[model samples]
Target: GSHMVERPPVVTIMGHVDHGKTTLLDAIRHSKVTEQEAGGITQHIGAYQVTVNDKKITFLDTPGHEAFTTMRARGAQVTDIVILVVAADDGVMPQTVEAINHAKAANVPIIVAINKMDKPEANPDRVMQELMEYNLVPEEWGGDTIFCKLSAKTKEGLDHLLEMILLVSEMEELKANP
Candidate 1:
């Protein structure tokens, strides 16, 4: 064995089915990759990296399906932050709650990124209310949970989201040792 070294942050993206979790990750990576997924699908977790202010952040893309029923089973606890992607239009669904619970079980902080804000029906306020009901409140609401709104199709408010993540990391003094 050798001394452990710190690496870039590892973010695990989890959310409900068809809530644009993979699309949001693709947006973060600034790549069009989910198309290559099986069956023109976007359900599998494909780890990748994204650069913000020239700093690389690693992501652990886990499948947004029953497949994730085993991350703890495999005895791995490398995840640092959980980016819980929820769609503004879709609000909170069953899978969103499941992801929240999973992150809670893993004892990691979660950042809520509301996706698909470009849609005509997309409503961030409504979604925020829903999130509050789920106990995920933003700082303005006097809760510790972080929340952001983004549109994968239009690349809206993405930079600010990244900045918030960096800020949270700073507050937590997060450092990866793997």
Candidate 2:
């Protein structure tokens, strides 16, 4: 007889620098290494795990900058899903595009996270529109990409995002035998 157990999905959080990837990780797992950097940027990649609703999820915090493209791609290769963090106020940028390519290249599902929704000028619709140009239409727009609006500052919509991750994980049937 063989016993199979559910395993946590390996998630990779990526996007352009300053897009709140660190903030989201910090908010979800109390992990922070950006501020300690010389320019408030991530200097090294890190992995962390968080429990949501009694379910475990492992996340990889990849540096969100063009210089870290290889690092980001490496992270994506090991992830079950890629959470593309796009700043609501800033829309998309070069690194965001790079991250998308890496995720697509890895053939993983992508969740477009509109971060900084707490900002006074935060515009989720604008992020959606920008994503469309990159062929990443949101589910509400009749596409497969999952979009979640959240604020790392106030921890708003974080639960919904985690739930979505779990939902997708189940749909993908991620499992392990030990």
Candidate 3:
């Protein structure tokens, strides 16, 4: 046997409903959010890939806690990282907490991307503080969870988000036999 081949991290986007999970994935996929907003995008959970910085990251595009439930649904582990998409203006929510619980139950690493930062009422600081309640503290707060604040509307910080994902995935054994 030789050295294992490096592979892209498989991501499950876990978040509250309408917290912009689809928009974030669509933004990552094509950077065209409004085009689907115009068409009224619908939910159909599956995997999609995007090349960033010459690397790839797969998004398991499931909405709500179902993103974290596939391990039971299929009896095999596919999720490597769970991207928790919390709305800056909305802070933590009922479903967000459940998503956090489901994520922890799966024993997968989490990366939080505070969405809707473009809104005037949006507050990343408040959202950051709220995450501590569930123990998903940001790195700036000296905790393990990596944080990225971005506006899916403007596509701001998307590159940094991908970079963070790539870096985190690099730190893990993402190599696969498939």
Candidate 4:
């Protein structure tokens, strides 16, 4: 008998400090205890497989933000998608842009998520415009890139984000069977 293998959609999350990137992942995984870490965020590289509608989506969570740039310099092309998380109230910070550049350098597609929208200070337009300046335009604004406004704290827009991902997959006709 021959062995069968499956390829899952691999996504990497990147963002500035305290942007709720980890929280978003936890929400998707339906697990919150992971956020109890020192900073409520990632301290190192992590990865997981999440089943959405019975379809597997693999995530490659990276950290040591600076180190990711170094790896790009070494001609590594292991990543598939980059989830660039930005806090709606906080907008783009240095590290957020750094991650953007890293993803751009790898020539991979990016899906921007405006996180923390549930905060009273959150401003979706401001976040969207800021993203445009960085060359990340959401589909609603007539841009090619897909963007989602999410609140990891409340799980708002998470399902929409996943839907957008599936839509993209369909458009790209991405597939593999186990």
Candidate 5:
């Protein structure tokens, strides 16, 4: 009678090529894999899973949009949430638009991960302000979008990233087919 069960949220990290999405994924990967060893993790299809607070968060790695689109074309709904890695200094670029529109096309919620926060030139406020042009107004501004500021290079705000993913996915009521 159990037709559905808990599905560990599947997230895609999408953004400009220069943004540190892979770094963010790498940082989370180290945190999860180091608790034991290599076998608990898997990639190559470019998908991997990490655990935070004992909850598994699955990820579709770099080149996220391509893989996400490919999966969708196969009639698969592989992404439950998308972490859009927009660089704090660079703000939104052409690919950032592509990533956002693509994520929207999948009909999934997007959590903005504002990266490079540790850099001296990084301007998170400017980044957030710029995102308004793309219609991603921050929660503090009375909008629905949640923004997580982080530095993948330094691991700043790293835990919050994982936590926010869970929060969004929880709100989405994700589940696995049984």
Candidate 6:
């Protein structure tokens, strides 16, 4: 009864379709897995785990269907942290807004992953400004949520994003029983 175990945080990658939700996950996972195997098949599941900084973090691997209905298809309570992926070039979209609302309604913490930063047309500043409309101000602007600009195609800022997830996990103080 006195024994307790610390478990990896459960994260959900959510965003508008073609915003690079799955692509980001693949970039993070592939960097490590590719050395062991080639052309691995990606699986759809309640969650998946990846090692970062010698610790594991579980990702829900939710589908990025139209309107993010795939996320709604699963129970909301199962998620711990939500990674809201938005394309920097595209700013915020209708599905992006919907994903933000869904995350808010679930009462889960959100990490904004501004994807496509490598694109010449990408604008992280505009993306940030647009997020304010949904009340998702970045920490630098004195808000609680975290924002990360990355290029999933080139694996840029992937480490920083993973580190941010770990930091948030530590702050949330998640635990589990073995």
Please report the candidate that would top lDDT against the real structure: 5
Model 1 stretches with alpha carbons more than 4 Å out: 1-8, 29-45, 54-56, 61-79, 105-107, 119-121, 174-178
Across 1-178, the per-residue lDDT of candidate 3 in tens digits comes to 1144443356767776677887776666665222222323444323456655555566664445455555454454443677887777777788778878777666566778778776664777778887877887777876657778877778776766777787775655553211
- Which has the better TM-score: candidate 1, or candidate 4? 4
At residue 86, what lDDT does model 4 achieve?
78
Q: How high is the lDDT of residue 71 in model 6? A: 52
| Worst 10 contiguous positions by lDDT, candidate 1 | 32-41
lDDT of 1 by residue, 1-178 (tens): 0123343466666776588876765565565333223222344535566655544565664455633334544454443677777876788889888777766555556777887766665777788777777676666676656777767778775766677677765665443211
lDDT of 4 by residue, 3-92 (tens): 233334566667765887877776766742232223223445344666566545566543555534345444444436677787777887
Compose the digit string of candidate 5's lDDT tens values, residues 69-126: 5544536455456688877778878877777776666656667787777666577778
Report the C-alpha displacement of residue 23, candidate 5, in angstroms.
Answer: 1.1
lDDT of 5: 0.66
Per-candidate clashes come to 1, 0, 0, 0, 0, 0
Q: Judged by lDDT against the true structure, how good is candidate 6? A: 0.66
- Candidate 6 per-residue lDDT, tens place, 50-119, comes to 7666556666544557332345544334435778888777767787777788776555567888887766
lDDT (Cα, 0-100) at 129 in candidate 1: 77
Q: Between 2 and 5, whose lDDT is larger?
A: 5
lDDT of 2 by residue, 82-153 (tens): 788877778788888877876655555678778877666577777888877777778788655678887776
Task: List the candidates' TM-scores in order.
Answer: 0.69, 0.70, 0.72, 0.70, 0.73, 0.72
Report RMSD (Å) for each prediction in the order shown.
5.7, 6.7, 5.9, 6.0, 5.4, 6.0
